[PDB]
Amino acid sequence: EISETNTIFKLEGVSVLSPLRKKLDLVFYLSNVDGSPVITLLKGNDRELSIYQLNKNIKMASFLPVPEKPNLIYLFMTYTSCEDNKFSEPVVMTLNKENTLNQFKNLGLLDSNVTDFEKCVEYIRKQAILTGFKISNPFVNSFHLQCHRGTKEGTLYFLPDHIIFGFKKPILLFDASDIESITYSSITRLTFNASLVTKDGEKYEFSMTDQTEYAKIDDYVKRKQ
Ligand SMILES: [Cl-]
C-alpha cells in the first residue's frame, strides 16, 4: 500500500500530541486503490492514523508557534474521517526544525548548507497544495497568549477564522463567527479574565490573561462581529 514509488513525502520522528502522544512518521502518499493522496502517521510499517480525500476532508491545517520554543513548530489539522462519519477531528504534532532541516538535506530536498527552516515550511505547504489542500502559516494580525482554563494553563491562538485553545485535552476550536459575546472581568492587578459564550450557549472561561492582550482581543472580537 505504501511504497517508495507512490510516497510524495516522509518526515520521520515527528512528536504527535493529539489524538495520542507518540513519536511517528508523517507520510503523504498516493493510494493504490485510486491514486488519491493520503496522509498517514506510521509506527514502523503500522498505521496510527490516516486522512483520506484531502481535497474535501481536511477542514483546517495550520503551522502555529510553540510558545517559548523557537526550536519547535506545531502542525495542527482538523479533518472528517476516511469514512465520512467523524467530524472536525484534531491532530497536533511538533516538528523539531533542526532535525526537519537535516532530514530534508538527507532526502536531497535542500542543499547541504541551508540555514532556513522556512524552506521546509515552503516545501510542506507546496506538498499540501499539490496534494489537494492548503496549510496556513498565519504567523509568518494574528496572535497567541497564555491563560488558564481552571487550574490548567494552555495557549489561546487568535487566528483569521478560528480561535484555538491548545493543546492539552480537550483542545477547543471555535469558528470566529460562533462567538456570541466576550465579557471581561479582573482577578489580579496585572491580569484579566475573558468569559466567552458561543452561539449554542456554551460558556468558556479563560483566566489570568496579561492585560497587555486586552486591546488585541477586544479588537479581534469586534472585527469578527
Ligand atoms: Cl483560521
From Swiss-Prot:
Localization per Swiss-Prot or TrEMBL: Nucleus; Chromosome
Region (Double PH domain): 3-224
Domain PH: 3-135, 141-224
Variant or mutagenesis effect after changing residue 184 to A: Impairs histone-binding
Domain of life: Eukaryota
UniProt record similarity statement: Belongs to the RTT106 family.
Its job: Histones H3 and H4 chaperone involved in the nucleosome formation and heterochromatin silencing. Required for the deposition of H3K56ac-carrying H3-H4 complex onto newly-replicated DNA. Plays a role in the transcriptional regulation of the cell-cycle dependent histone genes by directly recruiting the SWI/SNF and RSC chromatin remodeling complexes to the histone genes in a cell cycle dependent manner. In cooperation with HIR and ASF1, creates a repressive structure at the core histone gene promoter and contributes to their repression outside of S phase.
Quaternary assembly: Homodimers (via the N-terminal domain). Interacts with the SWI/SNF complex. Interacts with the RSC complex. Interacts with the HIR complex. Interacts with the CAF-1 complex. Interacts with RLF2. Interacts with SIR4. Interacts with YTA7. Interacts with CAC2. Interacts with HPC2. Interacts with HIR2. Interacts with MSI1. Interacts with HIR1. Interacts with histone H3. Interacts with histone H4.
Name under which the protein is recorded: Histone chaperone RTT106
Encoding gene, per UniProt annotation: RTT106
Location of this fragment in the whole protein: 66 to 302 of 455
